[PDB]
Amino acid sequence: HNDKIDLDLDDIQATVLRERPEPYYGTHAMVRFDTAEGGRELLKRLLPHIASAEKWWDVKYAWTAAAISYEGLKKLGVPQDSLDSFPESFKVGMAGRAEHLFDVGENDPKHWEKPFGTGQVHLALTIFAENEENWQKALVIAEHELGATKGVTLLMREDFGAQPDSRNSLGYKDGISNPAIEGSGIKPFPGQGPAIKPGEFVLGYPGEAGVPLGMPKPEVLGKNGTFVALRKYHTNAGSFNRYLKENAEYTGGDAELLAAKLVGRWRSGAPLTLAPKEDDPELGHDPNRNNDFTYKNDPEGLEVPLGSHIRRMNPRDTKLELLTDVNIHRIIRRATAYGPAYDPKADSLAEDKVERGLYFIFISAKAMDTTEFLQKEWINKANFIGQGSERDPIVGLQDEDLTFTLPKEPVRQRLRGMDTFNVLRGGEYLFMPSLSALKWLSELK
Numbered sequence: 123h124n125d126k127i128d129l130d131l132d133d134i135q136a137t138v139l140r141e142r143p144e145p146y147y148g149t150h151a152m153v154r155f156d157t158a159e160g161g162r163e164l165l166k167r168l169l170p171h172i173a174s175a176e177k178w179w180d181v182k183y184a185w186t187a188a189a190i191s192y193e194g195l196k197k198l199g200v201p202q203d204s205l206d207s208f209p210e211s212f213k214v215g216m217a218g219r220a221e222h223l224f225d226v227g228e229n230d231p232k233h234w235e236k237p238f239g240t241g242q243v244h245l246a247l248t249i250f251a252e253n254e255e256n257w258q259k260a261l262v263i264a265e266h267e268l269g270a271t272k273g274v275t276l277l278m279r280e281d282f283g284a285q286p287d288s289r290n291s292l293g294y295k296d297g298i299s300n301p302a303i304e305g306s307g308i309k310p311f312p313g314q315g316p317a318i319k320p321g322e323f324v325l326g327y328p329g330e331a332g333v334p335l336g337m338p339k340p341e342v343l344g345k346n347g348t349f350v351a352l353r354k355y356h357t358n359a360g361s362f363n364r365y366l367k368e369n370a371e372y373t374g375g376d377a378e379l380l381a382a383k384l385v386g387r388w389r390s391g392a393p394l395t396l397a398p399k400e401d402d403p404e405l406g407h408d409p410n411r412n413n414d415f416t417y418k419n420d421p422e423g424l425e426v427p428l429g430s431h432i433r434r435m436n437p438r439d440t441k442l443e444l445l446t447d448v449n450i451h452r453i454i455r456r457a458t459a460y461g462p463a464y465d466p467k468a469d470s471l472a473e474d475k476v477e478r479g480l481y482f483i484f485i486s487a488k489a490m491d492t493t494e495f496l497q498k499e500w501i502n503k504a505n506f507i508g509q510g511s512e513r514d515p516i517v518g519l520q521d522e523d524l525t526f527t528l529p530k531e532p533v534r535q536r537l538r539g540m541d542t543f544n545v546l547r548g549g550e551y552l553f554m555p556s557l558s559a560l561k562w563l564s565e566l567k
């Protein structure tokens with residue numbers, strides 16, 4: 123490590139601190155506890171296989187993450203006093219909080235894929251791996267322990283990764299910008315700072331306001347845990363490709379530059395702030411360069427539009443309406459693309475029905491609050507950036523009359539006619555407990 127360690131890394135789950143591998147392979151599995159006894163036995167069987175964040179900066183070929191819903195803790199027999207100490211948003215669950223998320227219309231929970239939104243997801247298991255061999259080793263273990271456990275049911279399994287050049291379902295490099303955590307042991311990459319106080323991401327530690335956020339009780343249940351918003355999206359890549367072709371007239375006929383303007387980065391990962399006129403793939407793949415900007419040199423969005431995805435999600439130095447503290451609205455993202463590789467040349471309606479997309483694991487000590495805030499305030503409206511009702515082009519709920527403001531000299535351009543290019547298929551609010559908490563849960567009576 124190269125910075126003072128303040129976190130109990132040996133007790134925090136690996137996924138809280140470990141970056142997604144590149145390349146990456148893995149599996150998401152949703153599990154229901156049919157009995158309390160089955161859920162506890164499953165956790166006991168899995169605990170030796172759930173790695174901590176010890177030396178999270180080092181190479182690790184695979185790890186297995188575990189996160190538990192409100193209905194899963196209830197079913198395990200967590201006492202009512204403990205259940206009551208969780209946030210109300212978590213207890214209600216993601217679908218129940220649809221109004222706070224603007225999960226309406228195409229994203230309404232009524233239309234979600236089973237098992238999401240029904241209370242049946244109790245445990246989400248995620249295997250992350252850097253190579254196929256170690257992915258399969260961890261998968262064999264997890265499936266063996268699941269099969270061996272009476273009283274649990276595998277609801278759904280979906281494999282992810284294996285994408286060409288690790289690109290996501292719209293062909294973008296991702297996993298680039300995540301918060302640095304003061305006390306993790308590792309100094310920020312250039313532009314990744316400022317390091318955020320640890321309590322914003324790990325319960326039991328002081329946050330930006332100097333005190334620990336509210337946490338579950340007793341201490342062995344809440345300390346060194348965190349919250350997760352898990353969201354699965356389907357990607358409509360045919361409609362996205364057709365949109366780029368039909369609106370590239372607004373970016374000199376260059377469809378890849380329009381792709382860069384909508385997200386804020388070229389698909390290579392190069393941010394427009396550091397590559398405003400042509401792509402720079404080498405820069406895009408280099409973590410010591412690809413995040414080293416703050417928008418101070420782009421107050422008007424002539425490089426990165428103020429309503430582009432990344433500038434919405436992390437405004438950095440942008441002048442917003444109302445002096446907002448961005449440090450308390452950060453989120454750790456583990457993004458996992460799934461399904462057939464993105465095809466940049468496929469623009470048919472049938473291409474939209476290819477089963478590809480992304481899962482996100484959004485991690486924070488207040489993941490419910492921050493996911494709701496981002497969804498309601500920075501994705502599905504634009505008051506903070508002074509562009510009215512415009513919604514995020516990549517994950518906002520679109521209709522054809524909503525616009526995307528593309529700053530240009532001498533006059534701005536407003537594109538329109540977007541679809542919702544990434545549609546929510548389901549999600550859950552989950553608790554990612556410490557290793558000590560997992561042991562405690564498995565030993566409830």
Ligand code: HEM
Binds near residue numbers: 298299387436493517
């Ligand atoms: C669902 C489809 C989505 C796609 C295809 C997508 C794609 C991307 C891409 C390409 C990047 C830039 C590379 C990187 O920094 O990793 C990015 C960044 C980011 N996205 Fe998304 N994203 C999606 C949804 C979301 C949602 C729902 C949220 C939060 C509620 C979100 C939050 C962020 C954040 C915080 C960043 C980093 C911004 C920064 O620090 O500069 N994304 N996303």
Ligand SMILES: [Ca+2]
Binds near residue numbers: 361540541
């Ligand atoms: Ca359409």
Ligand SMILES: [Cl-]
Binds near residue numbers: 140456
């Ligand atoms: Cl990551």
Ligand SMILES: [O-]
Binds near residue numbers: 297457
């Ligand atoms: O992403």
Ligand SMILES: [O-]
Binds near residue numbers: 457
């Ligand atoms: O993202």
